[PDB]
Amino acid sequence: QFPRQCATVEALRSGMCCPDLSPVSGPGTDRCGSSSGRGRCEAVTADSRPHSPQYPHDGRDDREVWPLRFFNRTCHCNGNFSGHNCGTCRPGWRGAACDQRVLIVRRNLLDLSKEEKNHFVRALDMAKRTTHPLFVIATRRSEEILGPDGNTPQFENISIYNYFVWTHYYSVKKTFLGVGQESFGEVDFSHEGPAFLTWHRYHLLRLEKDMQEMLQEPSFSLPYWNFATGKNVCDICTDDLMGSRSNFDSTLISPNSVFSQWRVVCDSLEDYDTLGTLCNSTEDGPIRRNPAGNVARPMVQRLPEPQDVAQCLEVGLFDTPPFYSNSTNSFRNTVEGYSDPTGKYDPAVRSLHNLAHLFLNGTGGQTHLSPNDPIFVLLHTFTDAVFDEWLRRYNADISTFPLENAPIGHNRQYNMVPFWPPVTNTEMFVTAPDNLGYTYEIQWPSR
Numbered sequence: 001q002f003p004r005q006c007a008t009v010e011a012l013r014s015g016m017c018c019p020d021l022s023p024v025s026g027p028g029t030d031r032c033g034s035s036s037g038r039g040r041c042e043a044v045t046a047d048s049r050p051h052s053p054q055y056p057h058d059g060r061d062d063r064e065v066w067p068l069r070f071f072n073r074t075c076h077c078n079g080n081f082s083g084h085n086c087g088t089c090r091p092g093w094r095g096a097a098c099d100q101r102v103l104i105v106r107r108n109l110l111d112l113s114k115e116e117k118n119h120f121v122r123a124l125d126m127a128k129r130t131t132h133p134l135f136v137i138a139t140r141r142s143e144e145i146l147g148p149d150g151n152t153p154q155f156e157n158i159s160i161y162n163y164f165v166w167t168h169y170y171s172v173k174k175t176f177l178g179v180g181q182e183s184f185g186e187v188d189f190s191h192e193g194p195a196f197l198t199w200h201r202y203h204l205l206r207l208e209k210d211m212q213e214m215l216q217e218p219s220f221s222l223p224y225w226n227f228a229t230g231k232n233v234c235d236i237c238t239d240d241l242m243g244s245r246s247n248f249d250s251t252l253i254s255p256n257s258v259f260s261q262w263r264v265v266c267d268s269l270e271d272y273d274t275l276g277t278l279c280n281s282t283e284d285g286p287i288r289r290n291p292a293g294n295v296a297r298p299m300v301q302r303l304p305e306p307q308d309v310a311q312c313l314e315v316g317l318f319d320t321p322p323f324y325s326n327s328t329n330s331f332r333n334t335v336e337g338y339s340d341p342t343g344k345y346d347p348a349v350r351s352l353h354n355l356a357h358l359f360l361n362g363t364g365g366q367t368h369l370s371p372n373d374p375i376f377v378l379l380h381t382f383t384d385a386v387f388d389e390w391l392r393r394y395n396a397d398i399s400t401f402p403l404e405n406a407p408i409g410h411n412r413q414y415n416m417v418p419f420w421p422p423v424t425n426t427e428m429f430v431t432a433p434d435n436l437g438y439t440y441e442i443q444w445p446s447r
């Protein structure tokens with residue numbers, strides 16, 4: 001989750017993650033591109049405000065007041081610069097001066113030409129096989145991060161797409177208990193609470209940027225899946241897109257799709273929750289997908305209706321107390337899918353984003369594994385298009401987004417876990433076209 005440069009004994013010892021940009025005069029002489037004016041090494045801001053109660057709750061979780069368990073100094077960039085060392089630009093800008101506005105367009109995957117479709121799944125496949133040039137992922141919790149001999153950082157290289165999967169797993173994993181310790185309350189830094197929409201927003205942005213980097217195609221954009229069709233099939237589960245059903249195993253992907261070759265990460269909950277370890281970069285086993293195949297829950301075998309999208313955009317409050325999966329008249333809880341499309345919570349309703357996950361009846365539905373099915377990307381670009389439309393209709397009314405007593409990870413000014421450099425929910429609560437340099441090509445149901 002940290003730059004390779006910072007995953008060292010010395011940098012953890014200093015508490016400082018401020019890598020050089022262009023260290024012409026030797027190591028440490030252009031931290032954060034300070035010698036060119038691009039940024040400065042400064043103290044991290046981290047939300048201190050209180051969260052909703054948990055019984056029991058030790059507070060030993062390395063995700064509290066993120067990222068303070070590891071670093072308390074990052075790069076703060078000036079102007080429209082950013083990046084872990086301020087070597088790149090804020091979203092929406094390009095150039096060595098970061099002064100050319102760029103605007104990329106995210107579109108319906110089904111609206112793409114045959115050429116762009118092939119470019120997408122090949123780009124996706126590439127990002128699955130290519131080492132992240134920048135981030136490395138911890139395989140051990142903080143108290144063991146430096147190894148048995150105390151001089152060996154427990155960090156692994158990981159692929160671009162697997163990093164996208166890893167960050168999501170880390171945000172939802174259970175707090176370790178240990179030996180003799182009671183069952184700690186279950187927590188979720190990226191779902192069941194207001195930060196769900198902004199966490200996943202940044203999640204996508206980080207993948208888009210990493211893939212534009214990988215391809216050296218600055219305008220590359222992630223497309224989206226309109227799952228609000230009422231359909232009983234998955235209309236992008238074809239061999240020229242996300243993969244059709246295997247004729248040999250009806251829960252596998254057709255061997256004629258590259259995605260049948262993908263192998264998953266983070267599928268060892270039993271190992272982690274007992275050995276005390278974290279998901280690592282070693283893959284094991286294929287994607288399972290079985291659209292409309294959940295015969296035990298008939299509600300989970302059709303997709304959301306088109307009016308479900310239009311109706312949830314009528315919920316005027318962004319979120320409501322207790323800012324959880326049981327909130328009512330909360331647009332966040334509606335689009336996430338624990339309340340019905342009108343606003344009304346019911347513990348039996350599964351709608352919209354949650355409905356779309358369960359529909360797949362496979363790897364795409366398990367909360368710790370779901371990004372391993374690449375349909376995740378396009379399910380979430382769609383979800384984010386709904387978020388972006390809400391932000392527009394209601395001028396980004398951030399007021400009902402709680403500053404405190406939200407579930408842990410979800411306070412308005414929390415640094416979304418485990419993204420780097422630190423980045424608060426507030427920074428994602430903006431219309432995308434003007435403030436984040438992307439927009440959606442989408443028409444909304446007009447009822």
Ligand SMILES: *[C@@H]1O[C@H](CO[C@@H]2O[C@@H](C)[C@@H](O)[C@@H](O)[C@@H]2O)[C@@H](O[C@@H]2O[C@H](CO)[C@@H](O[C@@H]3O[C@H](CO[C@H]4O[C@H](CO)[C@@H](O)[C@H](O)[C@@H]4O)[C@@H](O)[C@H](O[C@H]4O[C@H](CO)[C@@H](O)[C@H](O)[C@@H]4O)[C@@H]3O)[C@H](O)[C@H]2NC(C)=O)[C@H](O)[C@H]1NC(C)=O
Nearest residue numbers: 011012013014015016043044067068069070071072073142
């Ligand atoms: C920002 O981070 C700085 C770096 O700290 C690391 O990174 C952060 C993010 C965390 O991961 C942190 O745990 C990492 O260590 C941080 O500076 C560091 O602050 C710590 C905590 O105070 C310092 O450790 C303490 O040092 C004192 C005094 O130094 C003694 O040096 C020798 C060595 O033994 C002694 O013989 C002398 O008596 C010196 O006086 C120790 O008294 C103290 O030990 C006691 O406390 C610890 C827990 O803190 C217990 O385990 C012990 O048993 C003792 O009860 C600490 O070890 C550390 O030196 C310091 N490092 C540097 C490089 O400055 C900084 O404070 C953070 N800034 C902010 C604003 O929060």
Ligand SMILES: *[C@@H]1O[C@H](CO)[C@@H](O[C@@H]2O[C@H](CO)[C@@H](O)[C@H](O)[C@H]2NC(C)=O)[C@H](O)[C@H]1NC(C)=O
Nearest residue numbers: 290293294295296297358360361362363365366
């Ligand atoms: C996919 O759906 C199937 C069938 O709808 C699920 O397996 C059933 O789960 C129920 C409830 O837990 C069990 O009592 C049944 O024994 C299971 N049926 C069969 C035929 O095995 C399955 O868990 C779903 N998988 C995912 C990943 O969503």
Ligand SMILES: *[C@@H]1O[C@H](CO)[C@@H](O[C@@H]2O[C@H](CO)[C@@H](O)[C@H](O)[C@H]2NC(C)=O)[C@H](O)[C@H]1NC(C)=O
Nearest residue numbers: 052053054055185321322324325326327328345
């Ligand atoms: C939503 O779920 C929360 C969290 O479980 C519920 O809060 C509980 O409330 C009861 C009585 O009000 C307390 O005894 C529990 O200790 C609470 N749990 C926690 C974790 O704090 C709440 O009841 C639900 N809210 C609604 C509106 O139904």
Ligand SMILES: *[C@@H]1O[C@H](CO)[C@@H](O)[C@H](O)[C@H]1NC(C)=O
Nearest residue numbers: 004131132133134155156157
């Ligand atoms: C990680 O990758 C970089 C380049 O991508 C390489 O220089 C380095 O040796 C790799 N690190 C490890 C720990 O294998």
Ligand SMILES: N[C@@H](Cc1ccc(O)cc1O)C(=O)O
Nearest residue numbers: 350354357358365366367370
């Ligand atoms: N766990 C949610 C749905 C869900 C949400 C997020 C996810 O990654 C996977 C999921 O399956 C439910 O059953 O209502």
Ligand SMILES: [Zn+2]
Nearest residue numbers: 057059064408
């Ligand atoms: Zn706490």
Ligand SMILES: [Zn+2]
Nearest residue numbers: 040042076077
């Ligand atoms: Zn600054």
Ligand SMILES: [Zn+2]
Nearest residue numbers: 168190191200
């Ligand atoms: Zn998620």
Ligand SMILES: [Zn+2]
Nearest residue numbers: 353357370380
């Ligand atoms: Zn999701």
